[PDB]
């Protein structure tokens, strides 16, 4: 009686939101950006190849200086690279080799990683002893750690396969806020540039926008047909793009609270692993299961170019803060640095 | 062309590469085993004989270092991380023979033995384990014999025309799992009957792994 009545009210509320989004769907982003000229063909060459990982690379993250990056592989090795020289700055042996994510702190003093061990481990890069040591192990998730991102040297947000995200106080080792509401494994998260919000994509094919301080879900974005594996905020923080196993990338708007554009091709039938934007946001770069990275026109949904330099899955990618280059990590155990030439 | 600190930084990177190579060579020599099986299948008892996320067991037997990975504690989506174990030497699958007449606790309408069949079929025919051999432990053999006298296999297998002897009942169950192998040429299934009092379970894994290693070498050279 009461349960049946309540679940009927949820359906009425869902229709109310769907009608509200349809009311403000006056135009399409495709129609708006029809007049602007295309970006042309985007040609990028492999400037650097980072060799030394001996297993599948699962994650990479640039440091904020646009020169150092950290990559994680399931050979149990965290490597910090000097991308300008390809020198290895550090090699951090992981206690658990089943790493799935890694993050570089914006200060450059810490890196974080974690996987099937259900732990987010914090590593101190600047010690008087001259070696990288574990500074914190964040326990509390009951599923694998899928993504982690620093807010500062003391706070980090983690998404897990136990359907929840958490905000952690690194010094006390406790999760201050728990973000619940996903019905599937949360596979990725992205921080807004002001670090007041973050979006997460789960296996319920939905993306939720969370308030960091308040700790609740502000908006829910649907439209994917399969698990979301990747997510990335637009550079101004007013939009984000997702990548799913349905071979599509979608651009959702925060303020319009709906999808704006879909990035898919008929030839593309493989899942998407990673998404990122160029510095101006005009380019959407996506890594795929078909060993390739497709550069999309974000505004016009045109495939601008292809980065074809890996013999296995493109598992991760990232664009530097200065926008100079893009790094691609792959299951073939290599990282590549790409940019164009005049 | 390089400064004094640039040369020192390059030299430090060279030392890291040497250490990465040594660790990789050591890892390649170890034997990786993915330990699978449903709950209450005797899988925990197997670990003790072999002496909140993933549990790793390390043991040495006849100069061979084994790394056994237990993933039963993980309750998340299997398809999001099962590819992480692509490349293990072999998969150890545990099936409790005494659960043929039991009913799954959660479902209350699914046979416990039939629950392992769909788990075995998914793992055996998984795309990430096309060329991976499977070691099948049929546990609770002493308890299975006791239950056979009281409860026949007709409850578990309605279309069973065999007798109720201990040898015939166990052999039929073994053939049921091996028939689920949709790729009988790329991979092989090694079946062993285990018990809580058995002490030859480690030897069987060593023999099965040694056979897998030999066939891997023959296939790598292109002989197969």
């Amino acid at each position, epitope marked *: 009686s009461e349960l049946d009545q309540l679940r009927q009210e949820a359906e009425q509320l869902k229709n109310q939101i769907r009608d509200a989004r349809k009311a403000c769907a006056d135009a399409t982003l495709s129609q708006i950006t029809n007049n602007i000229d295309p970006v042309g063909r985007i040609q990028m060459r492999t400037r650097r190849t980072l060799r030394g990982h001996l297993a599948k690379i699962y994650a990479m993250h640039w440091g904020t200086d646009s020169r150092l990056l950290v990559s994680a592989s399931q050979d149990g090795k965290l490597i910090i690279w000097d991308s300008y020289t390809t020198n290895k700055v550090h090699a951090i042996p992981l206690r658990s080799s089943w790493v799935m994510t890694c993050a570089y702190a914006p200060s450059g003093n810490y890196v974080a990683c974690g996987g099937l061990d259900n732990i987010c481990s914090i590593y101190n890069l600047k010690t008087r002893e*001259g070696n990288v040591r574990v500074s914190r192990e964040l326990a509390g998730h009951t599923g694998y750690l899928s993504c982690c991102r620093f807010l500062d040297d003391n706070q980090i947000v983690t998404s897990s396969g136990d359907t929840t995200c958490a905000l952690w106080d690194i010094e006390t080792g406790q999760q201050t806020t728990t973000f619940t509401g996903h019905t599937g494994d949360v596979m990725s998260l992205s921080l807004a540039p002001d670090t007041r919000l973050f979006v997460s994509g789960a296996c319920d094919a939905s993306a939720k926008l969370w308030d960091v301080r308040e700790g609740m879900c502000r908006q829910t974005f649907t439209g994917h047909e399969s698990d979301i594996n990747a997510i990335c905020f637009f550079p101004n923080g007013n939009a984000f793009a997702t990548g799913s196993d349905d071979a599509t990338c979608r651009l959702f708007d925060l303020r319009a609270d709906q999808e704006l554009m879909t990035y898919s091709h008929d030839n593309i039938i493989c899942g998407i692993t990673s998404v990122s934007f160029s510095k101006s946001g005009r380019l959407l770069l996506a890594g795929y299961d078909d060993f390739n990275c497709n550069v999309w026109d974000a505004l016009k949904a045109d495939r601008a170019g292809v980065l074809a330099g890996h013999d296995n899955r493109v598992s991760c990618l990232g664009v530097t803060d200065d926008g100079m280059a893009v790094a691609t990590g792959s299951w073939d155990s290599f990282l590549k640095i790409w940019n164009g030439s005049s | 062309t390089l*400064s004094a600190e640039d040369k020192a930084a390059v030299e430090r990177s060279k030392m890291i590469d040497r250490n990465l190579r040594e660790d990789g060579e050591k890892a390649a020599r170890e034997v990786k085993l993915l330990l699978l099986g449903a709950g209450e299948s005797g899988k925990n008892t197997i670990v003790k004989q072999m002496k909140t996320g993933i549990v790793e067991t390390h043991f040495t037997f006849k100069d061979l270092h084994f790394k056994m990975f237990d993933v039963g504690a993980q309750r998340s989506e299997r398809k999001k991380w099962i590819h992480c174990f692509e490349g293990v030497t072999a998969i150890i699958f545990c099936v409790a023979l005494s659960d043929y007449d039991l009913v799954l606790a959660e479902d209350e309408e699914m046979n416990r033995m039939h629950a392992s069949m769909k788990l075995f079929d998914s793992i055996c025919n998984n795309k990430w384990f096309t060329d991976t051999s499977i070691i099948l432990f049929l546990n609770k053999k002493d308890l299975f014999e006791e239950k056979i006298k009281k409860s026949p296999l007709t409850i578990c297998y309605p279309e069973y025309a065999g007798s109720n002897t201990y040898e015939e009942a166990a052999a039929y169950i073994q053939c049921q799992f091996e028939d689920l192998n949709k790729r009988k040429d790329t991979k092989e299934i090694y079946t062993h009957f285990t018990c809580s009092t058995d002490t030859k379970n480690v030897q069987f894994v060593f023999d099965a792994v040694t056979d897998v290693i030999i066939k891997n070498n023959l296939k790598d050279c292109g002989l197969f």
Partner: single-chain antibody
Amino acid sequence: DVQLVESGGGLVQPGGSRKLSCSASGFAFSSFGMHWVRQAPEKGLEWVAYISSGSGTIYYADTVKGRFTISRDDPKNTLFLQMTSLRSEDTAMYYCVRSIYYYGSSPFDFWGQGTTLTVSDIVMTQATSSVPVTPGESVSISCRSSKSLLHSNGNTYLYWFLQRPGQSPQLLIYRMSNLASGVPDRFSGSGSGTAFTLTISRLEAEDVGVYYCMQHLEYPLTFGAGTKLEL
């Protein structure tokens, strides 16, 4: 805590041999390159030798090459300096210095207390030998180099050290602008090409001492004469 203890120094006869030891505790010794730096009595710092992490690269100063041998024992965390044919020119306090080299590292960050031995090229110029100072007032120290210390990679390999009376040198500024860990922000390093300035805003009693500018552009590492601050 990070420690570097030297031993084996003492009065030796001319033409003799002596073995200096540097025991390291509290840090990953095998990860750091090691230098021997000596300081003649009432004189400035002079670099002696360098052995890299992993013992693959070894450098010597010309005045000691062929007579000194530098070695390390990584399992024992000991740095060695085997000296032969010791001359009266070798009478100095010998310091054990750790230095790690990667992008953004701070070489020469920790020095040992030193052991005293008594026996019976880019030019770095610090023309101002002494500077009278008063607490709370801003002080500038100048350094010059015969060659440009700015490399084509953008680094300017100039270092600033402070040796307080009775103490071992401590790193203040590395690569001409970066502030060493544990150093107050009042110290600031400014330079261009061959001319460099160390500015000390709001001078305090602790800042009193001798200041050395060192180049790390190439071997042999050379020190300036040193500028002394006095009240």
